[PDB]
Amino acid sequence: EWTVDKIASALSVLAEEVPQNHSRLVNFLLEETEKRAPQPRHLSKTDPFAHMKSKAIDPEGVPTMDVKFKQHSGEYGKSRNSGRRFQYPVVCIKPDREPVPPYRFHHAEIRKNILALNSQLNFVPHKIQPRSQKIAKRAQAEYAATLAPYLEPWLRKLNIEGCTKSNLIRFMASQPESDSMTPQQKSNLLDTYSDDMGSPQAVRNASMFTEAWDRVFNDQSKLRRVALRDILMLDKNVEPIFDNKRAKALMQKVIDALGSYTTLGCLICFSHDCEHGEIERDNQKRCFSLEEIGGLMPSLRRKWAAQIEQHPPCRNECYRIHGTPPWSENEVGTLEWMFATIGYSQTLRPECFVGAILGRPCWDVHRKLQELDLRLPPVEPPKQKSLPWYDRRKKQLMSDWADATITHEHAVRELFAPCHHDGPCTAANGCPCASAGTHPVLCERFCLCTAEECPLKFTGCACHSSGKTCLQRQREGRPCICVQLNRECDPTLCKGCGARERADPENAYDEVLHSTGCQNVALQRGAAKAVVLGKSQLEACGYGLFAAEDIEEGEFVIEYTGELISHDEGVRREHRRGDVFDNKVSYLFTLLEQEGIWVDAAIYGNLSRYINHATDGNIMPKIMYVNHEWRIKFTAIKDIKAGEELFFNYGDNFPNLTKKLVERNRPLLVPKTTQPLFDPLSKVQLLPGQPLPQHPIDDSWLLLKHRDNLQDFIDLRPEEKEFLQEWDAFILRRHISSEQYLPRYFLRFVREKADWLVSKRSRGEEFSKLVATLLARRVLPERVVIEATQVLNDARGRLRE
């Protein structure tokens, strides 16, 4: 019969092996390291100093320094005498090079803004954790890690009924201290462990072990102490329950099957881990995804309604020819979600595609479809006054539109989820576009309303010209509504101005194309003027940026890229970089003032971060709405010649956040210049007339971060992670912001990965779920699902050898 005294006594004797094992380990490692001492390498065969004698003077015009030597002997180090001083000649050597201008951190280029996570204020140069709780919790964590591997062998040796790691976990869960645990966490503990702890003596023994352990190892006087509970929380089956990295009739099956894609699939760039969405205070992320606009059903139901309001046979034994191996439920689920998602289509049917996804003949799936008799839910079959300040058919603003809407006023906007209600976009119906702000904003492309239904629905500009158009001062009579709204043209909606071609980065350097047509897609085009880093002409500035080619007034120059951060992250960063203890050393570009988004180029950004302040600048920043991203462009306001330094008026663009918080109580050549110029990476000085360095952007570190973000979801199965990561790694490199270019990149993906996708069943399965999600959104044309069927049947055919 055990007592707390007897268990505590026994744990104390077992605990004696802990310092014994440790001494043995340290001694083992030291002995191993002694044996591994390295032999000296790269020795010269001759002593290189052999010919050099003492330079002590026994000189004329040579600088001299003194040295005083003392000699010592004995055990206490007593001097032999008071010392002897000697004079030595000095060899004076100057350096042959100046340092480059100063900087902190390694400055790396990003193609587009990246989304940061919130950090912890753990270090300030000189909410912070008191160093006392810092030291103490670290001490306890090290001791707990030391003791954890002893618990099971000790329990084995004690062999007390009910003193099981499992039963000690159940006892812990039942105690009142569980003051550290939440609903659903209990359910998952009870899913794995339940609450039955055995016989009464088993429950009694577990209680006395817990008490006895906490007495021996959790003495409150000591710094290194550990509660049994802290050991048990380290357990591999307990820890995931307290890990908060979670991603997430006929239609409930399909809703559940597509949930990873509807939850993580970005509506803008189509990646499942990307730079869009919202980061909450604890770094949980709300993705800018289908779930943001009501999940799959409101969009899918509308696809149905549009379908009910409206080629060759496949090379896989097409059911159009025939129509007739046990089907897995996964295989049946695959046919279910493809069927539901194809919907009431005329041009496309699931059998062929499902047949290419599965390794099955087309007539097989049709025969299985026919016996399944799948039936879609039935879908049920209002006049609204146009607004006096906006006509969406003529694509024109009029009257007091600048007083009627805040559509164009990015500094006051708040980022609500796009419309997904059922009725007209009015205050009565809870539409945030009409009523969430001080003024109505236009409904954008992700709102579920159509331009036919909704007087707030943005429909693009009407501009067209064989010459240049969509210009700031449009000498075409009617202005460009896109320009007026401080937004770039949409490649899909602005059909007349050629934005479809000019916003395509694959045409970025077609100077013929961009010499006419839309001049309002420069951020999407992605081409910057040639610029070169150098030492600024301004004294007390360090680096500056110089034109490396001539720039005419009104041309786009460069984008201000960087990390997107919250207000509080900006405050934390100002502290961490020493800016709060003053002289400004931290520059946070205000992107959306009211929403609280800043752009931070301290580490990641581009050469625009080096442009210096001048009240009379030659370029001008402007915040633009760019297909539901907000971005900062610079436009020349003077003619600028190659070799001249760029400047803009910083104005109020870089607020001190903590201060305002505290207050609330023709090849491209290096140009000729006077200033030294530098390669941004090597910091080698550049020479005029040499080729200008243009280094391709290094993005593989960023792809790794996004891949690992997906790997961290406890919520996702290995098969899901594998496909999501494969698609993301491909699609993030295309930097998509318009659905206009998705079909091209989708078909390139299916072709490059065709052998990979048919090599493993779950890959085609997961690929079909993506396809189903993009079809339900009506963002993937039917024609490319048809083509993808041929690509996969071909690859599967090429594999059978």
Partner: protein, 464 residues
């Protein structure tokens, strides 16, 4: 017996104040030349803020002779003030090259035998606080900077036009870096500084051709801010184990990264961990119940460093000789530990406990290193008395106090215990140690610090 001898003060010098205020100059670094043939007279450079003092040491039979002669004395005739050095060699001529780096962010490379500039390495955005040469390639040097990056440089002829071959960047460090160290295999790099993070980086292989840009590394393979609770100013490998020191802690910590072995293949840059959880202050590629990504092993006690920082220790670690850890504090003491004493003590304590039970106390302890063996001592009694051999350097059945003094110095049972120095030598006047260096054969140990002072310790001397 000789293998257990530890150093003693042999020579002392004061170099003229060169940051003149009359005595606020310091020696911040000392480095022995590592490329001389075996047995050559050992040569070290002591780096003050404005000078490199190059000395040869020669053992002497005359205790009144001066073993230290200054053979070269170089002044940085620029405006930079210096605090870091390391040795390299001319790749063509094999002449010694001394690299000196300081507060303007440039490395000067000196041809020390001819007293002229070899070249300058320009590129850092802030002052440089430490330099280390790769043990696997004498032309590869690492520099640690206020700009919070490590730059890796190559002096090989093919890299002459663009000698920065690697930048250790990204977000792994967030403030001034104070210490940089190479693993013996030349592929693993440790870095640490004011942000209290210790980072272990894996370097790629570098092409034997011109590199237009350095390779940029964005993620360390091991990262931790949790071994210390303060700014970290000295880091090194000890084989595969780690030694590190922080301000305010009065310890040198020996610890290890779980799952790290230099026998394993070097990981590639895309194997490194990325900070997906911002609440984790430790992350590791190497990780083999949760427990730990690192294990504290021992703490060498280093009393009276106060609030001082930029104080560096040095291990002597060569085949066939005892490993010796040396470090000087901020109150005129120099400390030594002979790491071989630990296993000998543990062997002695185990023999002692074993014989206590096999003879119920009938045990005689006799000092080793005398003409007397565990055989000659056994013939003086027989099978009734057990004879235990004790290391001579274990100095006082034994009293509780005597046992406690031995344990304080040699017991390795407690990772948060404090191991007392095995030899503690007092320094005349007020002294703060900045750096320690060892001669190739281990007979000389040189400590430099404030007051432009060098303390020169010797063992195995020739004095008669």
């Amino acid at each position: 017996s000789a293998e257990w001898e530890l150093p003693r003060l042999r020579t002392s010098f004061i170099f003229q104040d060169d940051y003149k205020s009359q005595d606020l100059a310091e020696f911040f670094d000392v480095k022995f030349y590592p490329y001389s043939p075996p047995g050559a007279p050992p040569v070290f450079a002591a780096t003050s803020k404005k000078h490199a003092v190059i000395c040869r040491l020669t053992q002497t039979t005359d205790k009144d002779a001066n073993p230290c002669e200054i053979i070269q004395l170089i002044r940085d005739d620029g405006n930079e003030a210096n605090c870091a050095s390391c040795w390299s060699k001319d790749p063509i001529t094999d002449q010694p090259l001394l690299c000196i780096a300081g507060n303007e962010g440039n490395v000067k490379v000196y041809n020390v035998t001819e007293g002229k500039l070899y070249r300058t390495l320009v590129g850092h955005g802030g002052g440089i606080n430490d330099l280390a040469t790769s043990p696997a390639n004498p032309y590869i040097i690492a520099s640690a900077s206020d700009d919070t990056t490590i730059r890796i440089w190559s002096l090989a002829p093919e890299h002459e036009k663009q000698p920065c071959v690697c930048i250790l960047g990204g977000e792994g460090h967030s403030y001034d870096l104070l210490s940089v160290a190479f693993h013996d295999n030349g592929r693993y790099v440790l870095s640490a500084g004011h942000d209290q993070v210790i980072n272990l980086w894996a370097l790629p292989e570098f092409p034997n051709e011109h590199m237009e840009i350095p390779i940029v590394i964005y993620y360390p393979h091991f990262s931790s801010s949790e071994i210390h609770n303060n700014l970290v100013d000295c880091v090194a490998f000890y084989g595969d184990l780690i030694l590190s020191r922080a301000c305010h802690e009065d310890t040198i910590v020996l610890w290890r990264i779980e799952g790290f072995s230099s026998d394993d293949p070097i990981p590639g840059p895309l194997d490194a961990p990325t900070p997906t959880d911002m609440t984790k202050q430790t992350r590791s590629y190497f990780t083999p119940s949760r427990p730990a990504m690192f294990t504290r092993l021992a703490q060498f006690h280093t009393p009276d460093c106060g609030v001082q920082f930029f104080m560096r220790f040095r291990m002597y670690h060569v085949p066939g000789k005892h490993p010796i850890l040396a470090f000087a504090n901020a109150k005129s003491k120099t400390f030594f530990w002979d790491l071989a004493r630990f296993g000998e003590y543990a062997r002695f304590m185990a023999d002692l406990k074993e014989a206590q039970q096999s003879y119920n106390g009938r045990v005689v302890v006799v000092d080793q290193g005398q003409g007397i063996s565990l055989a000659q001592a056994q013939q003086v009694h027989g099978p009734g008395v057990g004879v235990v051999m004790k290391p001579a350097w274990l100095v006082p059945g034994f009293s509780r106090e005597t046992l406690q003094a031995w344990a304080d110095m040699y017991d390795l049972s407690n990772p948060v215990g404090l191991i007392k120095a095995h030899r503690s030598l007092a320094i005349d006047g007020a002294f703060v140690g900045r750096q320690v260096g060892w001669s190739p054969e281990g007979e000389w140990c040189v400590v430099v610090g404030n007051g432009n002072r060098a303390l020169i310790y010797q063992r195995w001397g020739k004095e008669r």
